Write a protein that holds these residues in place. Structure first.
Motif, short mmCIF file in Angstrom:
data_model
loop_
_atom_site.label_atom_id
_atom_site.label_comp_id
_atom_site.label_asym_id
_atom_site.label_seq_id
_atom_site.Cartn_x
_atom_site.Cartn_y
_atom_site.Cartn_z
N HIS C 535 0.82 -1.20 0.00
CA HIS C 535 0.00 0.00 0.00
C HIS C 535 0.86 1.26 0.00
O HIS C 535 0.51 2.26 -0.63
CB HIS C 535 -0.95 0.00 1.20
CG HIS C 535 -2.28 -0.64 0.92
ND1 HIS C 535 -2.50 -1.99 1.06
CD2 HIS C 535 -3.45 -0.11 0.50
CE1 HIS C 535 -3.75 -2.26 0.74
NE2 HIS C 535 -4.35 -1.14 0.40
N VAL C 536 1.99 1.23 0.70
CA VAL C 536 2.87 2.40 0.71
C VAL C 536 3.47 2.62 -0.67
O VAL C 536 3.59 3.77 -1.12
CB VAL C 536 3.97 2.24 1.78
CG1 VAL C 536 4.94 3.41 1.70
CG2 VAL C 536 3.37 2.15 3.16
N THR C 537 3.86 1.55 -1.35
CA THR C 537 4.41 1.69 -2.69
C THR C 537 3.37 2.28 -3.64
O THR C 537 3.71 3.09 -4.51
CB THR C 537 4.91 0.34 -3.20
OG1 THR C 537 5.80 -0.23 -2.24
CG2 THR C 537 5.64 0.50 -4.52
N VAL C 538 2.11 1.89 -3.49
CA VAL C 538 1.05 2.50 -4.29
C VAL C 538 0.93 3.98 -3.98
O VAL C 538 0.78 4.81 -4.88
CB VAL C 538 -0.29 1.77 -4.07
CG1 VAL C 538 -1.40 2.45 -4.84
CG2 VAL C 538 -0.18 0.32 -4.48
N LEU C 539 1.00 4.34 -2.69
CA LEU C 539 0.88 5.74 -2.31
C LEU C 539 1.93 6.60 -3.01
O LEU C 539 1.62 7.65 -3.57
CB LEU C 539 1.01 5.87 -0.79
CG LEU C 539 1.15 7.29 -0.22
CD1 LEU C 539 -0.08 8.12 -0.54
CD2 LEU C 539 1.40 7.25 1.27
N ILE C 540 3.19 6.15 -2.98
CA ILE C 540 4.27 6.95 -3.55
C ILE C 540 4.09 7.09 -5.06
O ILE C 540 4.19 8.18 -5.62
CB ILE C 540 5.64 6.33 -3.21
CG1 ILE C 540 5.81 6.24 -1.69
CG2 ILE C 540 6.76 7.15 -3.82
CD1 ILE C 540 7.01 5.44 -1.26
N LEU C 541 3.81 5.97 -5.74
CA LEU C 541 3.70 6.01 -7.19
C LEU C 541 2.41 6.70 -7.64
O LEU C 541 2.44 7.51 -8.57
CB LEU C 541 3.76 4.59 -7.75
CG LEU C 541 5.05 3.80 -7.47
CD1 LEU C 541 4.93 2.39 -7.99
CD2 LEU C 541 6.24 4.50 -8.09
N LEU C 542 1.29 6.39 -6.99
CA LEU C 542 0.03 7.03 -7.37
C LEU C 542 0.08 8.53 -7.10
O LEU C 542 -0.47 9.32 -7.87
CB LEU C 542 -1.13 6.38 -6.62
CG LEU C 542 -2.53 6.89 -6.95
CD1 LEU C 542 -2.83 6.72 -8.43
CD2 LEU C 542 -3.56 6.16 -6.12
N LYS C 543 0.72 8.93 -6.00
CA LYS C 543 0.87 10.35 -5.70
C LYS C 543 1.65 11.06 -6.80
O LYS C 543 1.30 12.18 -7.19
CB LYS C 543 1.57 10.51 -4.36
CG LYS C 543 1.89 11.94 -3.96
CD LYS C 543 2.53 11.97 -2.59
CE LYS C 543 2.85 13.37 -2.14
NZ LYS C 543 4.03 13.95 -2.82
N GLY C 544 2.71 10.43 -7.31
CA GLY C 544 3.48 11.04 -8.38
C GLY C 544 2.68 11.24 -9.64
O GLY C 544 2.82 12.26 -10.33
N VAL C 545 1.83 10.28 -9.98
CA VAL C 545 1.03 10.37 -11.20
C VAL C 545 -0.05 11.44 -11.05
O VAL C 545 -0.27 12.25 -11.95
CB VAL C 545 0.41 9.01 -11.55
CG1 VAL C 545 -0.52 9.14 -12.73
CG2 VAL C 545 1.50 8.00 -11.83
#
Ligand code: CLA
Ligand code: CLA
Ligand code: CLA
Ligand code: CLA
Ligand code: CLA
Ligand code: CLA
Ligand code: CLA
Ligand code: CLA
Ligand code: LHG
Ligand code: BCR
Ligand code: SF4
Lengths: 227, 40, 742, 86
Positions: C535-545
């Motif tokens: 979930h943290v990895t999604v947060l970082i990548l989704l936030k960037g997009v």
């Protein structure tokens, strides 16, 4: 593909009629995949190469269709010794299926002569397609006189390839080209029939015909699925 | 051919040939004079 | 109604070495040549960024198409080498006779500088490096029985490699497809569904039915490999096949008469594992690929190309329109036919997720003979395909942000699904932010709770099976449901798909191939660690997009680009705001999350599955210490990392001594990377000034002015070395361990 | 004898039904696509195939409904044998 003759075949489409105007031999409008469209053509998919290739396939197939059955017919009539009454796929072309011992050389020795002979025949034929008329210029033992071509790659003509200058008139030549293509197309299907029939039944083309005539109902593709 | 020899003169190509040569020389020396520790 | 047709341009480009001698020709900026060392790095960084070299979509597509032929040609050289080295530098033929006692090996080292010690004793009168790639098991399943067969495939591989490189040259320099050709998405899906996947599956079913099944049936019976009939004899002689499988006596008539039950002898639905080899039945695998072939061939006739019948992908998207989503999927078709990055973002996401699914299914349902009892191969394959999936997913975030910055145009996106997502990005990130904090406390906090309670002498207060319990009841229910599936829900299946659900263990050569896996409190705790780190990895990548174009901090972030270091020290500091930096940070967390996944797999398998079968029962490699020890951080440090690293640190003086060296070297590269991550180029540019002065003093100063790396390259160099060192450290530790004991 | 058996009759009936349904405007054809409401509407065919059939029934409709008929027939034949009816 509509059998027989007709103005247009079953697969003829309004899209294919755009560029199929009857100029080519055997132009019945059948091009559902539209591979002969001149627009944005290139590579080997272009009208000149595809039409040239069909004729080359037609002529090889005609020799193959007649040559893959003549030994069986002549052998059946007793005109050749039984030792040479051999199925086309048991001549030696596919040793696993069967090979014939009795040629003057080992089949690989014969193949090398085939390679060298066909290298000259095929590369010289190619150079006339790439550079029309180029094979009639460089010395080739005086034979360049008959290799000048005629501008159309598939129909060299000349003193040899048109030994008896048939089809002198334009109308006559068109009919001959049409007859050549239809026989050639028919032979191409016949060769595919020989290959498929060999696998399904394991017998020669002549044997399959004789068996079919014997009991047509009990001998056909449907019954050959199992034996 | 002039351009092709110019490409071979680029830094990455020269380094690959040079280190391939340099490494080969060192490898071959240790093949005929294994385990050198002292000049002797 | 634009017709689907072949469209190319003749001789678009000339084949010359002129541009090979002019580095940077592709870009206007770099074409002028170098003045500083920064030019050299810029040359390699922008070489494959086609979308920035030209604004012409057609020119971009043609480069992509041919660059893909180069990738295919390289894989064939690589595949050819693997087959060639199996023929010439392997003990494969000896392995076929005694698979359970001989270690696969296909690499041999020369006797120089004393490195010949790496040629270990692997069996079969052969010395070489033991391989964990599983190629021997794959070759056996396909029916390869001699090094001649391996040799011919290698030669065929090189011919294919030459064909691939010719195709790339041909379709760029001779006959380059036009842009309208590339945009037939309906046609491409039809051919790739029914033609690539469909016919590929059918063709492989033909090989298995005619080659793999007969050969492996005799190999399992104990026939000597050299005495087995050759594959072409099986093909030509139906009499031989009838002996192995009587169904062949009836030919293909049952197929056309719909008496498909006649083929039950070689088209089975057994399930489970083959007891003799410990791998899936090949008769089951053949029926799988026959079923898959029909499904995909049907799938390839769905889209409309030239004859009316079929679906228009644009029409499907525009019809799915609801009350909650405004316009809906409108505008996606134009996005997905004009943006390569958008296509790459989707494909990397699912291709990476697929690679991770492969890892789970291959270990649980070992598809090759003698794959399961080769613990080195099982561990390596699972770990390899998890890492591949991890990198691909992070790339999906990278190229989703590139689309957002470069290919996104607001005019085409108004009130559609894409637009509405951007308009509540704060709601999405704020909620995903809270979920990560919640999951971090209630998963990693439990480990800290257990560690403190254990250190205080309060074991009864810990979260464990002998204390407060956390049972994965939902997972346990699913394990039981799949175990009883053959009775009621899959009546025609003889056994469960996997032995992990339950039942009895399968042992091959005295070693366990697979047995039921029990889920307890430790499994509950570790799984919620996975959910936390994913979930943290999604947060970082989704936030960037979502914030690629603008945020409340940088309202005009799109104009700055996709890859820039900052917008200066103003506003308190804006370091690492670009979407490129969200991939940079996302790589660390992906590495963190997958490291726990492969530690979880390694410890669970050794503790509960892998082991030696004896008269009394199963003794596992680590003796079932996962359940009691993996609930504390100290347990992982002591029982997993400290205890199992004994093999790697004692490797010196043996054939495994190479893993010891790489174990140290990997530790070095990892620590070396922290120099780039913890520093900034301001210090290094000043340091180079003093170094340049010394060279100037000696008239040996270069003409290309030395420059400290850029800000972004420092972060890229840092993360690349951090990943290489960390991953290589686990790689050495796993192989030296499992090869030594497994 | 396969001809006239249950398997043969079902396959001939299923194949015939799709051709009959498509020809008489009961199933979608090359010249008639289907809207979201499962209603037949006129379509545009890139490669307009010439056909002398009064209803425009092209050879593509034969292949489309030949395969559709075989799919329907094969499922019924194997399905009945599953429940013991056949
Ligand atoms: C990703 C793969 C790919 C794709 C999408 C294309 C696409 C294209 N190619 Mg290219 N090509 C490829 C790979 C590919 N090529 C490779 C690997 C080679 C090197 C061998 C070439 C060599 C090549 C040439 C020389 C030409 C093209 C041309 C074309 C165009 C027409 C193709 C066509 O109609 O084929 C239809 C196919 C045929 C007519 C031949 C079918 C039979 C072939 C020879 C073998 C197929 C084997 C099959 C997949 C597996 C059989 C299994 C078993 C029975 C053995 C089109 C733009 C032509 C072009 O530019 O047209 C404008 C053209 O002249 N291609
Ligand atoms: C593509 C064409 C083709 C090919 C490749 C083959 C190939 C083959 N045929 Mg077939 N055949 C073909 C067409 C073909 N045939 C046709 C069209 C017919 C019908 C007319 C036949 C009728 C036929 C029969 C009846 C037999 C074969 C046989 C054979 C096999 C042996 C060939 C041989 O010994 O030639 C011999 C070589 C030559 C005839 C060429 C001689 C070359 C020298 C150098 C010429 C010298 C000329 C001289 C100096 C001057 C002229 C002299 C002249 C005026 C007397 C071989 C598998 C035989 C077979 O299967 O045996 C088991 C066989 O019995 N074929
Ligand atoms: C992925 C591709 C790949 C890789 C990584 C390797 C790697 C290796 N190969 Mg292999 N090889 C490959 C593909 C590959 N090969 C292919 C496609 C072929 C077919 C031509 C071969 C044929 C081949 C031979 C014939 C030999 C190797 C050998 C070697 C080893 C020494 C190479 C060396 O230093 O050469 C020298 C370096 C330069 C010339 C520079 C090394 C482990 C050697 C080996 O293992 O000897 C024991 C060896 O004799 N390879
Ligand atoms: C000998 C044949 C040949 C020649 C003379 C050219 C010439 C040209 N090509 Mg063409 N090309 C060829 C073959 C050739 N090409 C082939 C086989 C392909 C298919 C892949 C292509 C695909 C292609 C594309 C897609 C493009 C060109 C372009 C160009 C131009 C510049 C190329 C350049 O700077 O290369 C110098 C580059 C290199 C020497 C790098 C080589 C890379 C290959 C794939 C090897 C990869 C090795 C790999 C990294 C190994 C692992 C590394 C690790 C161990 C460290 C020029 C007109 C470009 C152009 O016209 O731009 C306007 C362009 O965009 N070519
Ligand atoms: C793509 C996959 C594939 C392929 C290639 C094959 C291939 C084959 N199968 Mg197999 N099979 C498959 C899938 C496949 N199978 C599947 C999925 C099943 C499960 C339902 C089976 C079940 C099965 C059974 C039960 C049997 C076979 C059999 C066969 C063999 C004979 C088939 C036959 O009678 O063909 C009939 C005819 C043809 C296929 C047409 C051949 C057309 C040729 C190639 C044309 C050549 C034309 C050319 C121009 C001529 C050459 C000219 C040149 C020399 C100049 C053949 C090797 C039979 C066998 O012998 O097994 C040992 C058999 O009994 N298969
Ligand atoms: C199908 C896969 C794929 C493809 C086709 C592309 C294609 C592209 N990417 Mg993407 N990307 C992918 C996967 C892919 N990516 C993945 C999986 C990730 C996550 C890591 C990313 C992350 C990513 C970023 C962050 C960026 C791109 C960018 C790009 C573009 C330029 C790349 C370039 O110039 O590289 C040139 C190539 C190099 C400089 C070589 C890199 C060498 C690496 C670091 C070596 C690592 C170690 C090595 C593998 C093993 C040890 C070596 C040994 C010698 C020690 C290009 C369109 C860039 C861009 O601007 O896009 C618009 C960009 O900023 N990609
Ligand atoms: C071990 C090292 C470590 C730790 C503990 C953390 C912790 C955290 N990181 Mg960080 N991170 C690290 C290394 C670490 N990171 C590294 C090396 C990098 C560089 C690549 C990053 C990059 C990074 C990013 C980019 C992000 C995070 C995020 C997070 C948060 C995740 C969600 C959360 O709140 O979890 C809960 C918190 C914890 C598990 C911390 C420990 C809690 C203890 C065990 C219990 C509480 C103590 C208790 C109250 C007693 C206190 C007593 C005292 C007051 C006297 C969290 C604060 C993400 C975030 O902010 O998500 C919202 C995020 O976006 N990290
Ligand atoms: C007269 C009409 C008829 C009859 C009586 C049957 C009867 C039967 N069919 Mg058949 N079938 C028919 C027509 C018929 N079929 C037609 C027209 C088609 C073509 C569309 C099919 C296609 C078809 C398939 C593809 C299959 C059957 C199967 C079956 C058998 C088991 C069905 C079952 O219980 O599934 C109960 C299944 C479930 C409750 C599982 C549902 C969960 C799904 C699978 C999860 C995945 C969903 C999604 C992809 C994500 C059963 C004997 C099955 C079989 O062979 O069984 C031995 C089978 O696989 N039929
Ligand atoms: C679940 C929510 C489904 C929601 C669902 O199916 O909604 C359905 C609803 C679809 O509405 P429409 O019928 O208008 O959609 C038409 C579609 O064709 C799309 O255009 O979607 C939305 O309203 C989008 C925003 C949902 C916002 C959801 C917020 C809560 C997220 C919770 C995430 C939990 C993840 C758990 C993973 C296991
Ligand atoms: C009325 C009329 C007529 C008649 C017609 C007819 C009689 C027709 C027929 C037709 C037909 C009779 C057709 C058929 C077709 C078929 C097809 C086209 C098929 C296909 C198939 C497939 C594709 C299959 C597949 C599969 C497989 C292989 C496996 C399993 C699964 C499945 C099933 C999917 C005429 C013209 C004379 C004249 C005018 C009027
Ligand atoms: S120069 Fe460095 S420290 Fe300053 S804002 Fe940019 S990234 Fe941050």
């Amino acid at each position: 593909v509509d059998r027989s003759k007709d103005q247009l075949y079953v697969g003829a489409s309004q899209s294919s009629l755009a560029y199929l105007d009857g100029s080519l031999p055997g132009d019945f409008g059948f091009d559902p995949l539209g591979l002969l469209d001149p627009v944005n053509s290139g590579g080997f998919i272009e009208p000149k190469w595809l039409q040239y290739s069909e004729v080359i396939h037609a002529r090889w197939a005609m020799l193959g269709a007649a040559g893959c059955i003549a030994p069986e017919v002549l052998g059946a009539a007793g005109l050749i010794p039984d030792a040479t009454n051999i199925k086309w796929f048991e001549s030696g072309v596919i040793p696993p299926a069967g090979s014939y011992n009795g040629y003057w050389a080992d089949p690989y020795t014969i193949f090398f002569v085939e390679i060298v002979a066909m290298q000259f025949a095929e590369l010289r034929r190619l150079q006339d397609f790439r550079y029309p008329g180029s094979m009639g210029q460089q010395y080739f033992l005086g034979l360049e006189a008959i290799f000048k071509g005629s501008g159309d790659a598939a129909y060299p003509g000349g003193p040899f390839f048109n030994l008896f200058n048939l089809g002198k008139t334009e109308a006559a030549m068109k009919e001959l080209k049409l007859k050549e293509i239809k026989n050639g197309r028919l032979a191409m299907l016949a060769m595919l029939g020989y290959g498929a029939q060999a696998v399904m039944t394991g017998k020669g083309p002549f044997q399959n015909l004789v068996e079919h005539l014997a009991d047509p109902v009990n001998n056909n593709i449907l019954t050959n699925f199992a034996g | 051919m002039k351009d092709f020899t110019t490409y071979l003169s680029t830094a990455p190509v020269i380094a690959t040939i040079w280190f391939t040569f340099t490494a080969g020389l060192l490898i071959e020396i240790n093949r005929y004079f294994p385990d050198p520790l002292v000049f002797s | 109604a634009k017709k689907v047709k072949i469209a190319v341009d003749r001789n678009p480009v000339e084949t010359s070495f002129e541009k090979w001698a002019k580095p940077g020709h592709f870009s206007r900026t770099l074409s002028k040549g170098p003045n500083t060392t920064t030019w050299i790095w810029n040359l390699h960084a922008d070489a494959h960024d086609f979308d920035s070299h030209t604004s012409d979509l057609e020119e971009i597509s043609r480069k992509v198409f041919s660059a893909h032929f180069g990738q295919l040609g390289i894989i064939f050289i690589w595949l050819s080498g693997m087959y060639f080295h199996g023929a010439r530098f392997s003990n494969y033929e000896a392995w076929l006779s005694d698979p359970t006692h001989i270690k696969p090996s296909a690499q041999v080292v020369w006797p120089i500088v004393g490195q010949e010690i790496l040629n270990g004793d692997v069996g079969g009168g052969f010395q070489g490096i033991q391989i964990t790639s599983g190629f021997f098991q794959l070759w056996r399943a396909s029916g390869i029985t001699s090094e001649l067969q391996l040799y011919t495939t290698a030669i065929g591989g090189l011919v294919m490699a030459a064909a691939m490189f010719f195709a790339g040259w041909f379709h760029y320099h001779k006959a380059a497809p036009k842009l309208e050709w590339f945009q037939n998405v309906e046609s491409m899906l039809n051919h790739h569904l029914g033609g690539l996947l469909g016919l590929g599956s059918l063709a492989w079913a033909g090989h298995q039915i005619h080659v793999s099944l007969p050969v492996n049936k005799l190999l399992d019976a104990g026939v000597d490999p050299k005495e087995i009939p050759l594959p072409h004899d099986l093909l030509l002689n139906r009499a031989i096949m009838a002996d192995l499988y009587p169904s062949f006596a009836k030919g293909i008539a049952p197929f056309f008469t719909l008496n498909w039950s006649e083929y039950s002898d070689f088209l089975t639905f057994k399930g489970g594992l083959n007891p003799v080899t410990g791998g899936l039945w090949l008769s089951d695998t053949a029926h799988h690929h026959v079923a898959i072939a029909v499904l995909f061939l049907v799938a390839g006739h769905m889209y409309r190309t030239n004859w009316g019948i079929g679906h228009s992908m644009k029409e499907i998207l525009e019809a799915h329109r609801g009350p909650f989503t405004g316009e809906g999927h409108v505008g996606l078709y134009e996005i997905l036919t004009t943006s390569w990055h958008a296509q790459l973002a989707i494909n990397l996401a699912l291709f990476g997720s697929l690679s991770i699914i492969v890892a789970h299914h291959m270990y649980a349902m070992p598809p090759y003979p003698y794959l399961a009892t080769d613990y080195g191969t099982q561990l390596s394959l699972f770990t390899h395909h998890t890492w591949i999936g991890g990198f691909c997913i992070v790339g999906a975030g990278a190229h989703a942000a590139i689309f957002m910055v470069r290919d996104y145009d607001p005019t085409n996106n108004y009130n559609n699904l894409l637009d509405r997502v951007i308009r509540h990005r704060d709601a999405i990130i704020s909620h995903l932010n809270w979920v990560c904090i919640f999951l971090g406390f209630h998963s990693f906090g439990l480990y800290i709770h257990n560690d403190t309670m254990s250190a205080l002498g309060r074991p009864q207060d810990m979260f464990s099976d002998t204390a407060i319990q956390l049972q994965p009841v939902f997972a346990q229910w699913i394990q039981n449901t799949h175990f009883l599936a053959p009775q009621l829900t899959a009546p025609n299946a003889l056994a469960a798909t996997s032995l992990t659900w339950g039942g009895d263990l399968v042992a091959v050569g005295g070693k366990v191939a697979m047995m039921p896996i029990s889920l307890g409190t430790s499994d509950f705790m570790v799984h919620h660690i996975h959910a936390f780190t994913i979930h943290v990895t999604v947060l970082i990548l989704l936030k960037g997009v979502l914030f690629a174009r603008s945020s409340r901090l940088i309202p005009d972030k799109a104009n700055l680009g996709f890859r820039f270091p900052c917008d200066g020290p103003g506003r308190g500091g804006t370091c690492q705001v670009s979407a490129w930096d969200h991939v940079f940070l996302g790589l660390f967390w992906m590495y963190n999350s997958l490291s726990i996944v492969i530690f979880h797999f390694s410890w669970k398998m050794q503790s509960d599955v892998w082991g030696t079968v004896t008269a009394s029962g199963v003794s596992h490699i680590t003796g079932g210490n996962f359940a009691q020890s993996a609930n504390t951080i100290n347990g992982w440090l002591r029982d997993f990392l400290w205890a199992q690293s004994s093999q790697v640190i004692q490797s010196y003086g043996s054939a495994l001594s190479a893993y010891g060296l790489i174990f140290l070297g990997a530790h070095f590269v990892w620590a070396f990377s922290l120099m780039f991550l913890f520093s900034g180029r301001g210090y290094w540019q000043e340091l180079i000034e003093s170094i340049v002065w010394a060279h100037n003093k000696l008239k040996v100063a270069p003409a290309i002015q030395p420059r400290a790396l850029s800000i972004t390259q420092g972060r890229a160099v840092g993360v690349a070395h951090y990943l290489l060192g960390g991953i290589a450290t686990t790689w050495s530790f796993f192989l030296a361990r499992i090869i030594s004991v497994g | 004898g396969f001809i006239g058996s249950s398997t043969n009759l079902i396959m001939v009936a299923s194949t015939t039904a799709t051709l009959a349904a498509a020809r008489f405007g009961l199933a979608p054809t090359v010249k008639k696509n289907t809207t979201a409401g499962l209603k037949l509407v006129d379509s545009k065919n890139s490669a307009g195939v010439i056909s002398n059939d009064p209803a425009g029934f092209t050879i593509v409709d034969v292949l489309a409904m030949g395969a559709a008929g075989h799919g329907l027939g094969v499922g019924i034949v194997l399905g009945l044998k599953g429940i013991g009816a056949l």
